[PDB]
Design a protein around this ligand. Structure first.
Ligand SMILES: Nc1ncnc2c1ncn2[C@@H]1O[C@H](COP(=O)(O)OP(=O)(O)O)[C@@H](O)[C@H]1O
Ligand SMILES: [Cl-]
Ligand SMILES: [Cl-]
Ligand SMILES: [Cl-]
Ligand SMILES: [Mg+2]
Ligand SMILES: [Mg+2]
Ligand SMILES: [Mg+2]
Ligand SMILES: [Mg+2]
Ligand SMILES: [Mn+2]
Ligand SMILES: [Xe]
Ligand SMILES: [Xe]
Ligand SMILES: [Xe]
Ligand SMILES: [Xe]
Ligand SMILES: [Xe]
Length: 1285
């Protein structure tokens, strides 16, 4: 396959079939649905290699072999009409960046670029050219892809354009008109006074502005970048106001500075953490060690609402990716640890599952549907978190779309433009919290990805998470140098690209800069200087480093394979210049104070609109019907489709994730991580939000968001409320009638009143101020406007991660007690209950009593510390009804509760969404607990409800009357139906159905353990005691992310864990000949492009020296190796080097066709595995996190031979203890539950689950109560140590 392509040659290589049978069946069913009459469809990947020089035979064999990957689906002879789908010309897929990288690291420098498309073969012998266009429309994404008729057309993707010159705007030759034309032509969106400012600036300089200078200015001065609304002066109902919104937020720091180390002067806030062992590999020795020191806590939350309305997968992916850059660029370098995720969208209207409150109102053609956002968006957000390697541990998901009588009268209110929210916490060293001095002469570097023309095609983002992982490793090497950290100053690259980030950086240091345009790394030679300087390409940071640290920085980057460029120098003069060596001229030449000068402050002069509620019309409402609808509201309903798609175990520090208890029910109210791998100190995150309340009462909605963040985090051991710090993220349709006054009133409500009075700081925050959508529907104008939507995220240092309560009810003798901080108001306005009957109602919840909310929190903290709680679940969407139901789902039990003391209105008592929740206590503690609550002023809020009982009965009485009684299993399965329907349409429907149907089986005993050995016996102790510590090579390739906890597991077992990067082996810095033990760690090397683990394995196989090195290590008589997850995939690709491995299977795309992050039950089976000695017959859960873990054999003969040889070491079992292939008990579809195999001599074991994630009991999502510090998985590492003797 090989043809001229300008001054290069393009080779075409056929790949493998691209779609599984159920995917083919969906295409055919959709074609029949549109009646396009299609007899058959078949699809095959095809690869395109643009070559700068020819391949000899052996290089050609290498290239072909690199492009063999993926499940072994049945080939077909091409037949019918070819439609080839590729990335749009002018764009380079992330697949292409990563695959070309593999090619280069396998020695194929002749490969200039690799790209991939899908060839579809459609047999539909009479369709009009018209119907052909609809077939083509159906097979590609119009925002990213194009459809071609010939394989040869792929040459269009590799055209090199000449560099486009700068363009000047003729102000001197045409006057102000030139600026007006450029404003419209370049879409600068400039205000009249901004046009005046530019006109005057350039008249003063006596020369025309260049397009690049105007664009840079336009970006810096957008609402998005300047925050004009948040800095504006206000007049409200005729009275000037004393403070901006930002100054009201700051008020919370003026009033509670406690524990804050950094607020409002960085792209994250920082608060005090805990002195613990920070674990990392020394720069000199490569050995991992604990460094006992403060691990302070940074936090940040951001949105990506507009781009997600256009292209939701990269919109959500880069929302997370951008936020992750903020966290690593805090101070002088910091480390992201865990993430959170939020979505608000309009009604799903799932086909065949439409709910009675949903009405189709239309939408703009150019945006995607709510369903499309909730399909592709969570996948994009998880793709980044999974491929970058941070666990995603808490989040919210709301649907809202209704015609409502609100502040501006009857209007459509919703989320056509969605909220896509991404946030997280990380750790930072004390001495790096402060940005450093920028020395005159400092080198100014771009760290990260080559620029492309990115940033409405302009709203289609692009993510490459692996590129960002490689940058994070360099930032980690830097801060891991302590006082020798060479980062003087670092900033993320986001809006405005370099044109914002570089000026901001020098400016923050009191300097200017001089830059060379042609030093910036670019994958698009056609780009204009404007495009190069201003594009929003992803995975970039800017930093300043002293000239003499450049050789160190260079070494650090090269070992990580993180690209970087020196692109300029910091100057004493406060000027900004950008030179271009190619055109020999100066695209930018400005004083900074001209560039960064501001037009006058905004004034908003506005008036209050307040909705008068309508009383809830109850004609159609019964309690039973209300329970059924409310559990079908996606806001309320089970969230599994948002949770198991995202890793929750990488770092080995996750103590509490969303899934709770033996039945792994996602109801955890907040996330908890341990502060290190050697401590019980930790960090917690929770979310509060209640946007629909803002349709009745702006300030109540903001108070409730703060209050729910607190009730969600309250059963975690924190102590002083001033330890809890908030992000406030404000989404509004600024300018829409009544929203501006409501915004000022809501910010005041929290910043000036509620938070100072509770002792809560808001040291970080952001705002997104055009939350609305307009389009033409008949030839009527239509508009969908969001409620004011405050999202509060709460972050806190944790005193003891072991003491966290979850909603999992005990059935030992117990009391359930409601804490009703609604004080009997029982408001029903703006509840899930109102919304599911198409109403807004009358009067919403609110914070009823500030002393009692603080009293609530302090009481909860006293009960958590004294271990007086069995369970906790707060009340929010769905009310007390949903809180009790979710506790019964998590406990897999019944409730017998009486509500007579809660008012005569049972509907109001069950469904109000007032603050509070239900604690469960031992029956014998009930009196002391009620006395404790009374001491905090709560007696009149506290109500004994009844008890949790074994069994399936969910019973609510009022005196002698049954208010509501149903099977708990029935409610649990209704509550599951949304995630079932989402999984069924997104993933393999067979796996969605199995998962859902297992829920209806009440006899399910949940995760449960059988141990064949003593989990507390440290069999490595006599070896550790001698002080003899053998090395283990902790092997990582670029994109590996689980190596730190892997090293820590081996360390606890007595090893000296050495960081061995593949670059170390390629560069000769490490030899395997010096090791007896090797482990290949997990993650996403090369983003799994070319098959998970393949580029890592082939880069070994195709370098003869490193390959000989691996083969020698494996052939030694006493070496031990382990491969986990990515390392298990890598090693299965290395069988030719491993003796005794001939029967090993391949590991390919899970049968569900979805990444699976699960806490799965396995049994240890009889094999030669030396790492599993003493464990055979044990059954216990383990962390699973993979999308390519399905064992695939050549045929049954290979499966039988593998089995009969006795080499299977681990199998998935269902909770009844049987070997299974039913999902998700077996999360990936592996035959015979196979998930680990060993070699004939037992010296090498590979497995897909992560024992290193869960070797600490505290890091097991569920575990038996009596376990000590060590989980059963700790024994694998101790077995390695004892085996080496
Ligand atoms: N978008 C999301 N991504 C990840 N996890 C989520 C998301 N939405 C909700 N969750 C998790 O699902 C569980 C139930 O969520 P939800 O009912 O919104 O919480 P609550 O009602 O306690 O505020 C929680 O553990 C939450 O963290
Ligand atoms: Cl169709
Ligand atoms: Cl702009
Ligand atoms: Cl939009
Ligand atoms: Mg103090
Ligand atoms: Mg909920
Ligand atoms: Mg909650
Ligand atoms: Mg919530
Ligand atoms: Mn009151
Ligand atoms: Xe190719
Ligand atoms: Xe400017
Ligand atoms: Xe956390
Ligand atoms: Xe108590
Ligand atoms: Xe090992």
């Amino acid at each position: 396959g090989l043809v001229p392509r300008g001054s290069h040659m393009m080779e075409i290589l056929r790949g493998s079939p691209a779609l599984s049978a159920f995917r083919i069946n969906k295409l055919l069913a959709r074609f029949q649905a549109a009646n396009l009459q299609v007899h058959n469809i078949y699809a095959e990947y095809v690869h395109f290699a643009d070559l700068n020089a020819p391949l000899n035979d052996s290089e050609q064999a290498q290239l072909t072999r690199l492009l063999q990957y993926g499940p072994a689906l049945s080939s077909h002879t091409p037949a019918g009409k070819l439609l080839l789908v590729t990335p749009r010309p002018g764009t380079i897929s992330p697949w292409s960046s990563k695959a070309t990288d593999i090619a280069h690291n396998c020695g194929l420098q002749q490969v200039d670029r690799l790209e991939r498309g899908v060839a579809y073969y459609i047999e539909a012998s009479t369709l009009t050219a018209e119907q052909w266009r609809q077939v083509a429309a159906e097979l590609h994404d119009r925002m990213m892809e194009t459809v071609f008729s010939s394989l040869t057309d792929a040459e269009k993707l590799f055209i090199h354009h000449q560099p486009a010159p700068v363009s000047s705007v003729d102000l001197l030759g045409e006057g102000r008109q030139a600026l007006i034309d450029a404003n419209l032509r370049l879409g600068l969106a400039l205000a009249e006074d901004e046009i005046d400012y530019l006109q005057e600036a350039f008249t003063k300089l006596g020369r025309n502005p260049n397009d690049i200078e105007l664009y840079m200015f336009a970006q810096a001065n957008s609402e998005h970048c300047r925050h004009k609304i948040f800095n504006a002066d206000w007049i409200i109902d005729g009275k000037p106001q004393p403070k901006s919104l930002f100054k009201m937020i700051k008020n919370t720091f003026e009033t509670t500075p406690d524990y804050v180390l950094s607020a409002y002067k960085d792209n994250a806030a920082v608060m005090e953490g805990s002195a613990v062992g920070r674990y990392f590999a020394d720069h000199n020795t490569g050995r991992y060690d604990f460094h006992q020191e403060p691990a302070h806590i940074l936090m940040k939350v951001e949105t990506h609402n507009h781009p997600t309305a256009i292209s939701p997968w990269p919109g959500a992916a880069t929302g997370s990716g951008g936020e992750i850059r903020d966290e690593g660029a805090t101070g002088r370098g910091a480390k992201p640890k865990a993430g959170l995720v939020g979505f608000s969208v309009s009604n799903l209207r799932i086909p065949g599952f439409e709910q009675p409150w949903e009405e189709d109102f239309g939408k703009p053609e150019r945006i995607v549907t709510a369903l499309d956002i909730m399909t592709e968006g969570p996948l994009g957000g998880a793709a980044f978190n999974n491929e970058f390697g941070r666990p995603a541990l808490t989040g919210y998901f709301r649907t809202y779309e209704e015609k409502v009588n609100s502040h501006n009268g009857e209007e459509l209110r919703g989320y056509h433009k969605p909220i896509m929210l991404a946030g997280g916490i990380g750790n930072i060293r004390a001495d790096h919290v402060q940005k450093g001095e920028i020395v005159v002469g400092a080198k100014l570097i771009v760290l990260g990805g080559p620029a492309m023309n990115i940033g409405d095609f302009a709203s289609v983002q692009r993510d490459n998470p692996e590129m960002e992982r490689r940058c994070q490793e360099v930032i980690d090497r830097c801060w891991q140098l302590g006082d020798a950290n060479p980062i003087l100053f670092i900033h993320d690259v986001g809006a405005g690209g370099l044109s914002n980030a570089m000026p901001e950086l020098v400016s923050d240091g009191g300097r200017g800069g001089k830059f060379e345009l042609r030093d910036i790394l670019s994958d698009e030679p056609g780009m204009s200087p404007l495009e190069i300087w201003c594009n929003e390409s992803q995975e970039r940071y800017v930093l300043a480093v002293a000239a003499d640290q450049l050789p160190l920085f260079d070494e650090l980057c090269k070992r990580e394979r993180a690209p970087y460029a020196v692109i300029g120098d910091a100057t004493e003069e406060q000027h900004l210049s950008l030179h271009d060596n190619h055109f020999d001229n100066q695209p930018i030449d400005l004083p900074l104070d001209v560039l960064l000068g501001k037009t006058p402050k905004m004034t908003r002069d506005v008036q209050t609109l307040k909705a008068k509620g309508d009383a809830l019309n109850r004609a159609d409402i019964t309690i039973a019907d209300a329970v059924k609808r409310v559990l079908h509201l996606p806001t309320v309903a089970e969230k599994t489709f948002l949770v198991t798609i995202g890793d929750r175990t990488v770092t080995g520090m996750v103590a509490r994730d969303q899934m709770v208890g033996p039945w792994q029910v996602p109801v955890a109210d907040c996330a908890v991580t341990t502060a290190s791998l050697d401590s019980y100190y930790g960090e917690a995150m929770s979310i509060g939000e209640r946007a629909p309340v803002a349709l009745l009462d702006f300030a109540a909605s903001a108070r409730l968001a703060v209050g729910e963040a607190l009730t969600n985090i309250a059963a975690t051991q924190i102590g002083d409320i001033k330890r809890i710090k908030l992000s406030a993220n404000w989404m509004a349709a600024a300018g829409h009638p009544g929203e501006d006054a409501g915004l000022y009133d809501a910010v005041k409500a929290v910043g000036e009143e509620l938070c100072p009075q509770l002792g809560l700081t808001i040291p970080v925050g952001k705002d997104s101020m055009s939350m609305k959508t307009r389009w033409q529907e008949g030839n009527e104008q239509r508009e969908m406007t969001s409620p004011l939507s405050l999202v509060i995220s709460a972050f806190a240092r944790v005193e003891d991660v072991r003491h966290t309560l979850t909603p999992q009810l005990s059935t030992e003798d117990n009391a359930l007690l409601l804490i009703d901080l609604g004080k009997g108001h029982n408001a029903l306005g703006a509840t899930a209950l109102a919304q599911v009957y198409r109403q807004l109602g009358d009067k919403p919840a609110d914070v009823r009593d500030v002393a009692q909310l603080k009293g609530f929190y302090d009481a909860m903290q006293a009960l958590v510390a004294a271990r007086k709680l069995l369970a906790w679940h707060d009340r929010s969407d769905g009310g007390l009804l949903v809180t009790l139901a979710e506790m019964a789902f998590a406990g897999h039990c019944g409730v017998q509760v009486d509500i007579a003391a809660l008012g005569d209105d049972h509907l109001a008592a069950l469904f109000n969404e007032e603050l509070g929740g239900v604690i469960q206590v031992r029956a014998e503690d009930r009196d002391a607990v009620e006395a404790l609550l009374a001491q905090y002023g709560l007696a009149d809020c506290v109500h004994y409800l009844g008890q949790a009982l074994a069994g399936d009965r969910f019973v609510i009485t009022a005196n002698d009357q049954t208010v509501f009684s149903e099977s708990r299993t029935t409610l649990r399965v209704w509550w599951a139906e949304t995630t079932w329907q989402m999984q069924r349409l997104r993933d393999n429907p067979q796996c969605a159905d199995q998962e859902h149907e297992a829920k209806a089986n009440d006899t399910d005993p949940g995760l449960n353990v059988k141990l064949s050995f003593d989990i507390n016996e440290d069999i490595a102790a006599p070896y550790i005691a001698t002080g003899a510590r053998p090395k283990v090579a902790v092997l990582r390739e670029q994109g590996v992310n689980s190596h730190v906890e892997m090293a820590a597991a081996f360390h606890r077992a007595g090893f000296d864990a050495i960081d061995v990067h593949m670059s170390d082996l390629l560069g000769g810095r490490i030899g395997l000949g010096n090791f007896h033990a090797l482990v290949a760690c997990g993650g996403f090397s090369y983003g799994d492009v070319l098959g998970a683990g393949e580029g890592w394995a082939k880069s070994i196989l195709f370098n003869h020296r490193v390959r000989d090195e691996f083969e020698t290590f494996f052939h030694r008589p006493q070496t031990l190796a382990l491969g986990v997850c990515n390392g298990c995939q890598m090693m299965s690709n290395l069988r030719e080097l491993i003796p005794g491995s001939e029967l090993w299977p391949r590991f390919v795309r899970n049968h569900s066709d979805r990444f699976e992050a699960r806490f799965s039950l396995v049994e240890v089976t009889q094999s030669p595995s030396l790492l599993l000695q003493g464990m055979v017959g044990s059954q216990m859960p383990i962390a699973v996190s993979h999308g390519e873990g399905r064992v695939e054999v050549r045929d049954d003969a290979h499966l039988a031979a593998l089995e009969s040889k006795g080499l299977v070491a681990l199998r998935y079992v269902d909770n009844f203890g049987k070997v299974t292939e039913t999902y998700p008990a077996n999360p990936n579809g592996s035959p015979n539950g196979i998930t680990a195999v060993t070699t004939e001599n037992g010296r090498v074991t590979i497995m897909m689950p992560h024992p290193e994630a869960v070797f600490r009991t505290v890091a097991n999502s569920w575990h038996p109560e009596n376990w000590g510090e060590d989980s059963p998985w700790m024994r694998i590492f101790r077995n390695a140590r004892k085996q080496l003797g």
